[PDB]
Design an enzyme around this catalytic site. Structure first.
Site, short mmCIF file in Angstrom:
data_model
loop_
_atom_site.label_atom_id
_atom_site.label_comp_id
_atom_site.label_asym_id
_atom_site.label_seq_id
_atom_site.Cartn_x
_atom_site.Cartn_y
_atom_site.Cartn_z
N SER A 206 59.94 60.20 77.59
CA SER A 206 60.50 58.88 77.29
C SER A 206 62.20 59.17 77.37
O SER A 206 62.68 58.31 77.88
CB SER A 206 60.20 58.16 76.03
N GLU B 98 63.98 49.15 57.21
CA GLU B 98 63.71 49.88 55.74
C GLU B 98 63.80 48.98 54.54
O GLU B 98 63.09 49.54 53.61
CB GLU B 98 64.68 50.94 55.69
N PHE C 104 66.69 58.27 62.51
CA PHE C 104 66.86 57.97 60.98
C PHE C 104 65.28 57.87 60.54
O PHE C 104 65.03 58.37 59.54
CB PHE C 104 67.42 56.53 60.90
N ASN D 124 56.05 53.84 78.01
CA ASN D 124 55.74 55.57 77.49
C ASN D 124 56.16 55.51 75.92
O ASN D 124 55.17 56.25 75.26
CB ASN D 124 56.72 56.51 78.41
N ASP E 122 56.82 55.50 50.60
CA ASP E 122 56.71 55.09 52.18
C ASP E 122 55.57 54.76 52.90
O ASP E 122 54.46 54.87 52.29
CB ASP E 122 57.93 55.68 52.78
N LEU F 18 64.26 59.29 52.26
CA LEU F 18 63.43 60.30 51.78
C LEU F 18 63.82 61.03 50.70
O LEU F 18 64.64 61.64 51.06
CB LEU F 18 62.66 60.67 53.06
#
Ligand SMILES: [Cl-]
Ligand SMILES: [Cl-]
Length: 162
Positions: A117, A11, A104, A132, A20, A32
């Site tokens: 998955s 990040e 996250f 996948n 972002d 966020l």
């Protein structure tokens, strides 16, 4: 290496409001603020999150404080989710971190949707799960980060981050 260091690499750190990868108002270490297109609305969310009139700027400690809360939240979100918990519990320490990373980034709901998955991961079919995982919007929009996370699940090592 650990989850904090892992996410800090993924990040980055910005002390001033920024947009972002999706065009959303964010600050600090991937925190966020809002999906709304209004800068003011984001400044208001920020002040509310920090507990002061920030004016769209925060300090390093403040950024770190939002980060600790966000990581703690992600973990607790996983543990409370019927679809995620079982996967999380079946994984080793390193892959658990890969799962936290995804939550996250995309939120618990988001991840809960990678049904196939998740099942492969729970079954310990590493190579198949990596394949996948790649067939997704996530991979196509943020390929380098996605590749780091997928390698982590595939190998169970921190090699993609060293
Ligand atoms: Cl908050
Ligand atoms: Cl990327």
């Amino acid at each position: 290496m650990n989850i904090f260091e892992m996410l800090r690499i993924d990040e980055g750190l910005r002390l001033k409001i920024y947009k972002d990868t999706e065009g959303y108002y964010t600050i600090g270490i991937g925190h966020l603020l809002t999906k709304s297109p209004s800068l003011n609305a984001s400044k208001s969310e920020l002040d509310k999150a920090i507990g002061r009139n920030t004016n769209g700027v925060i300090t390093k400690d403040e950024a770190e404080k939002l980060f600790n809360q966000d990581v703690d939240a992600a973990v607790r979100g996983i543990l409370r989710n019927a679809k995620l918990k079982p996967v999380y519990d079946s994984l080793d320490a390193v892959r658990r971190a890969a799962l936290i990373n995804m939550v996250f980034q995309m939120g618990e709901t988001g991840v809960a949707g990678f049904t196939n998955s998740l099942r492969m991961l729970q079954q310990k079919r590493w190579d198949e799960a990596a394949v996948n995982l790649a067939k997704s919007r996530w991979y196509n929009q943020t390929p380098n980060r996605a590749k780091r996370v997928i390698t982590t699940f595939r190998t169970g090592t921190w090699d993609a981050y060293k």
